Design a protein around this ligand. Structure first.
Ligand SMILES: CN(C(=O)c1cc(OS(=O)(=O)c2ccc3ccccc3c2)ccc1NS(=O)(=O)c1ccc2ccccc2c1)[C@@H](CC(=O)O)C(=O)O
Ligand SMILES: CN(C(=O)c1cc(OS(=O)(=O)c2ccc3ccccc3c2)ccc1NS(=O)(=O)c1ccc2ccccc2c1)[C@@H](CC(=O)O)C(=O)O
Ligand SMILES: CN(C(=O)c1cc(OS(=O)(=O)c2ccc3ccccc3c2)ccc1NS(=O)(=O)c1ccc2ccccc2c1)[C@@H](CC(=O)O)C(=O)O
Ligand SMILES: CN(C(=O)c1cc(OS(=O)(=O)c2ccc3ccccc3c2)ccc1NS(=O)(=O)c1ccc2ccccc2c1)[C@@H](CC(=O)O)C(=O)O
Lengths: 419, 419, 419, 419
């Protein structure tokens, strides 16, 4: 069981190049199944799910190869059944369903085998595809979706805002006959990037980023080159890394417009921020951060995926600040780990009251949440002494070489084996 | 477009005989598809959905004939497809699916509708049957279900409490091999009555009325006689009719234990209530009702289907009272119509604050909700002058000729044609 | 009972001058009690609540006079008890409490009678003042806040985001000793305007418009001239008026940056929009609006107060659009009224599915909600025939001479008496 | 910092005598302030809050002595101010306010007051007494209340169901002039016990245990003897101890009717249960428990205070079960700790998916929640090896001699000092 042994305190400053967001690459890679001609997807990080996706595609007959980018030739996809073995490892597998039925008339993917009925997020995808006119067969724990001829554009009203369903329906719609309208579509920048990728390939899509996306089905999609957008959460993580340690950092290969809320919130924390076309710099001028009030909400509002990091910011800030989770629940579990490092905080409902302290103290900590865990690593970097963050594989699955990037900013960090 | 013209004010008093609840008759009638020998279902109201149901059953090869009861012979069901032009008219149609698959190994019900993903009742039925071992198929606008051998008893966890799915799973489970357990099962009296009907036919069910139902599949179900339970909402409607007009009334053919919450609430209003084995009496002794506090909640708590009527009660009562709806979002379309009749009320979220007035004024009103509409008719009976309630067909589908019953209580009411 | 008789259809085009938002005038007027020298508040609409406010202030010993602006001389306030008869008429009465205690060490106001322990929004104002160090007295259905010397700065965490309390706490804090921090502060433009008015008088406030306001108490506040911000809701009502009638309009004396969400949404409807420093223009080029998907949320997201109007826009638009209300659970009481005029819509929870028609029909309609009512008047303007909107006094309280501004845009409208 | 060192695995079996519920004793003890003649309160556990309450009562001039019971002579209460250092230690202190004002016309309690406006739980107590006619004064960080003559019975609507406020209002009302009606009152068994205690002293109360309580004020309350009801949560803890260890146990001095939902839930888990008039027996017949579905809700439904215990039951049971919390969003802090002991579970919102494992492994764990912590000691008892539960003072506050009771069932447990 790998883990991170950190030594603090260390001022984190310098530069970092932001990787491509896997949250955007994943939906794009599966969207690539629609491409009749070769596609070069640039700026894809090297993470477990990317490997898994490449294997799954290859086992569907698509020629795949990578490096900084992943090259895809889906001109000859001839197998339409996603193998259980690869599918079981990730939520993104479901995305191979829509493209296959839309382009080849058939797709089969295994489904989770819980016990609860009317919840399985996967159900929206199945119904979304049925709305587009796919015949659906639910048997032996899987879904076999198919259609005779092309799918038909439909007017779809999403009851729940779903990032996953938005991608399935939008991707499938690009090859349907007619127009598809998705009301209450997920607005995430990653949706926008997937929309833009499909457009780059010849699709007709507008309204991405808003509450309703409109797709005008076309005969087929070509190929080409497309660059995955920067990881806005990785960016936030590092901006907070500088913001909580009196440092100054510049994030390269970044996209400022996906972080209006986070940037504004850092300024309120007292950060001196400048942005360029593809970079963001943050300077604390050696000062401690000033406590802020945070309210997580749907994009473009403050992102829940930046919450654990700002919680940490407040715990080491000047004053008191309350982080409110307006949407999710049981989201402050990493907080007791921070308290063990000396932080002063009270959890009350969907709220955590933060009382900044001078310095945190090294301790042995662990967090199952990816972001909560990265927060524990930044905490270790500015804590007095030695901090040991366990089960860091959660971080490895979402961040590309975080230790190398942190070390380059001044952190004393070492990965270790043996449980 | 039929409508009711009412002349008020009148003190509603006398007696009324409560009809059988169509909400229990419908699920029972479809459950009868499992009966191998003749069944006599007594106390069935004469309402539109009952006719449609009788036509649908006949279309499937079952011998149907009615009057006060419906005599069913499903010994020879030989067609397992519920035609689209018989299904599109009512939700209850879906209940033919489970019984056909369970008894004959196959079935299909036309699937009307269109929009709304995620929240598409029927989804629950589909997965319930699949969990019981059936292979689902969605094609040609049909929901199709088949199974090899009998359905397999299964332990099912209902994510959302659902009356419709509870009926489908419970009914279908009676003929499955093994035990079926339904967690978080609908608790309504109509579920309980359906369970009892099935038990009357030879089924093994226990727990009906609670969070979890347990069914022990048997070889086959026989026949017999069963009386549909009284319509608790119709009963509540007439008790309120008297409670808000200083009247006295006795409801015959009633079942008191399905109304603890409603009767308790009326006493709080100052009603003097008496109950028997099969009757309930209410006397206001000429007094205005006293304002009450109401909170709709899951059965056995106060029923949301009695909410509109109690809003009326508070609006003509002594004092201020607050109606709280913890079940339906926007279930207050009756409030604006009442205000035009001179009622003083403020809507504040899932709440309506009521300021009882001495009297209401006749006015032209209309409401699409069945219960809100019935309440407008009552409002007209006690309002000064002439009231015209339009689109009363909403009432006709759920109440067995409410105008005759009301008139016997003293009301001056006329059904009129011409838009 | 006054009402509007409207003759349709008429294309609404031309120009309109936007009045000041009474929603910002009210809090500012009461804030003026803190001014030690004369204050000229410009751009104040002539509405019922403004008259009441001027009367109330006069009863406290302030010299008040008005026209386009209101003059306030609070240098000699000598009576610190807001009279019941003037206070009972409007919610804004509560805003006289904080200033009186903060500047004179005492203020007394009557409170809403009844029950609903826990509901009352005035509680937040009371407890807010208590945190600032005020001695509170709750007797005989009213409040007495008093302080010996000055109030003291405090760190306050708002559990509920409250426009009213934010104003009370923020205003009173301007004269307190030390720093006050309000977390989870209301972010509305009107709060921002009040903050700026206070600042103009010498207060030290920052963060207005964000989740946390910070105030630095000062010895005293001076006087001056301040102009109330444009009514962003009146503005939106008029943009929609043009947007649903193939019209073209220019809104003068407007403030574009308070409507980012509304302007964007109108563009999605197909409106051609250009804005300037103090004006906004909208041109449909004789086209019907295209249906839009709307999700009301907290400012700066799409405003719930524009919801009724956009519902109307969709109902006459091309296509289907759903309006989800994440805010006010209930808020579609206007829909039924629009249906009677021929609109096709379905209410599904906190949602209304709209199916645009080409032409609405005149009818007799009424709505208690201010915005809903103004929508009916707009509906009547584009409807075929005659429309009669009753109970227009609701509109008269929130709109300054709406009939005069509509007529100038070409509407055929006239006010009528006799119930 | 004391802590428990546990040796597993051991089969917990035998008998345990259930203590009085401190949750009933506390409200009863303060209610005893209304007694004019000596009162013997039997079956009171020996816990920190009881000692604190006895000291506080003593300060007020009440003669107090104790052992199994707490004898009270409040005939001579002559000081009506609960001192700050004597109040700051527990929430129950607020219960001294109402009786003092009701019986002596005056009282004041020191106030906590940190942040959280419109969320401070003492507000309801305050507004409650005000509805009863008391003058409220907030100053000196005290809540002073007084009344002219007696309190006046009022009709009070509770917006939030509140255990604490229900007690303050109900208790104070026993001496008010006229009738008091509490709508939406807390229904807990501890409320009912407090009602019966007051009735035992001569009070007139009815409806306790339901939605609305009605109190008819009397001249004065006398003295006597009353036995505090058994700790239903403690009972539940022990039944789970046997149920998760293949054990058999008999709980003496118990009250079965306060645990309907818990007992039913245990039967579903496979427990063989028998109950008597004052005892409950549970037998697993050496078998593992079966996984169950649990949804916490308001009493009489499944209690949130038994939730951590049942989470543990599922985690060592046969199969998968999802635990749902609709009361306390973060009542899951025990899972991370249980996973560390080898359990397999996933948290998802107000839910925790549990996958039972054959046996758990000892580890070092700690939980701040009283119940979560007691569950860790149970996990320790059936865990393989040696478990150490830190900061067990949380358990000491709410359970009387848990070690001694656990030891007598067969556990290997030892308390240890030194951090
Ligand atoms: C994001 N979502 C998911 O569960 C999710 C994550 C996936 O994979 S990722 O990690 O590459 C990814 C991709 C795009 C993202 C965009 C914005 C933010 C985060 C992202 C993460 C891929 C699909 C997803 N959603 S889904 O409806 O097809 C889906 C598919 C299969 C599942 C199987 C078991 C349980 C849940 C499942 C959900 C949830 C996350 C949550 O539960 O808070 C949601 O709320 O929308
Ligand atoms: C009850 N439910 C339904 O929509 C419902 C009503 C039906 O028929 S009834 O009128 O004979 C009936 C039967 C039992 C009742 C018990 C308590 C209260 C009212 C009842 C009414 C029969 C099935 C229903 N639900 S369902 O999931 O299979 C179902 C089936 C087919 C559908 C087709 C299109 C749209 C919705 C559908 C819902 C709704 C009722 C509502 O929305 O107010 C619910 O939310 O629970
Ligand atoms: C705005 N608010 C109110 O209830 C409200 C309205 C007032 O008056 S107005 O009409 O001149 C006005 C002023 C400023 C505004 C700024 C942005 C948006 C709308 C505005 C309207 C003045 C004060 C208010 N809020 S309050 O907490 O002191 C308050 C005070 C006394 C009350 C008495 C009975 C019932 C509710 C009350 C609320 C509510 C409105 C609601 O949600 O129903 C809220 O959103 O919190
Ligand atoms: C019980 N209640 C409390 O927060 C609570 C607990 C107290 O003390 S105990 O531990 O001896 C106790 C007594 C009776 C119980 C009955 C059923 C279940 C648990 C119980 C626990 C004593 C008073 C309480 N509530 S209160 O409104 O006067 C109160 C009083 C003073 C406070 C000071 C600071 C912060 C919060 C406070 C809350 C809450 C518990 C919850 O939030 O779930 C409620 O259900 O309303």
């Amino acid at each position: 069981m790998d883990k991170f042994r950190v030594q603090g305190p260390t001022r984190l400053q310098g530069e970092v190049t932001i990787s491509g967001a896997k949250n955007a690459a994943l939906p794009i890679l599966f969207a690539a199944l629609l491409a009749e001609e070769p596609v070069e997807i640039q700026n894809v990080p090297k993470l477990k799910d990317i490997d898994t996706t490449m294997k799954l595609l290859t086992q569907l007959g698509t020629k795949v190869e990578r490096x900084g980018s992943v090259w895809i030739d889906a001109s000859n996809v001839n197998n339409f059944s996603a193998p259980y073995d690869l599918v079981k490892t990730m939520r993104a597998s479901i995305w191979a369903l829509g493209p296959l039925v839309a382009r080849f008339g058939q797709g089969q993917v295994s489904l989770p085998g819980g016990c609860a009925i009317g919840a399985r997020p996967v159900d929206l995808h199945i119904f979304g595809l049925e709305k587009l006119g796919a015949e659906i067969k639910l048997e032996e724990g899987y879904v076999k979706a198919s259609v005779n001829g092309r799918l038909k554009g439909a007017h779809i009203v999403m009851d729940k805002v779903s990032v996953g369903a938005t991608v399935t329906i939008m991707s499938a719609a690009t090859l349907a006959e007619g127009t598809t309208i998705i009301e209450n579509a997920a607005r995430e920048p990653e949706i926008v990037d997937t929309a833009n990728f499909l457009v780059a390939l010849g699709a007709k899509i507008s309204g991405q980023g808003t509450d309703r996306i409109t797709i005008e089905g076309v005969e087929r999609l070509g190929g080409g080159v497309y660059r995955v957008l920067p990881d806005r959460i990785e960016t936030g993580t590092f901006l907070v890394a500088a913001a909580i340690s009196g440092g100054k950092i510049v994030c390269r290969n970044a996209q400022p417009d996906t972080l209006d809320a986070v940037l504004a919130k850092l300024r309120e924390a007292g950060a001196d921020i400048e942005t360029g076309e593809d970079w963001i710099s943050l300077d604390m001028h050696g000062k401690r951060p000033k406590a802020v009030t945070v309210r997580t909400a749907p994009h473009p509002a403050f992102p829940t995926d930046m919450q654990a990091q700002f919680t940490l910011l407040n715990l080491v800030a000047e004053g008191t600040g309350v982080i409110t989770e307006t949407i999710f629940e049981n989201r402050f579990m990493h907080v007791p780990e921070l308290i063990r490092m000396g932080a002063h905080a009270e959890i009350e409902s969907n709220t955590v009251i933060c009382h900044g302290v001078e310095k945190l103290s090294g301790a042995q900590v662990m967090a199952t949440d990816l972001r909560a865990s990265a927060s524990l690593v930044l905490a270790g970097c500015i804590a007095e002494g030695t901090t040991v963050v366990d089960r860091i594989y959660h971080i490895d699955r979402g961040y590309e070489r975080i230790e190398d990037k942190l070390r380059a900013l001044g952190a004393n960090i070492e990965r270790v084996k043996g449980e």
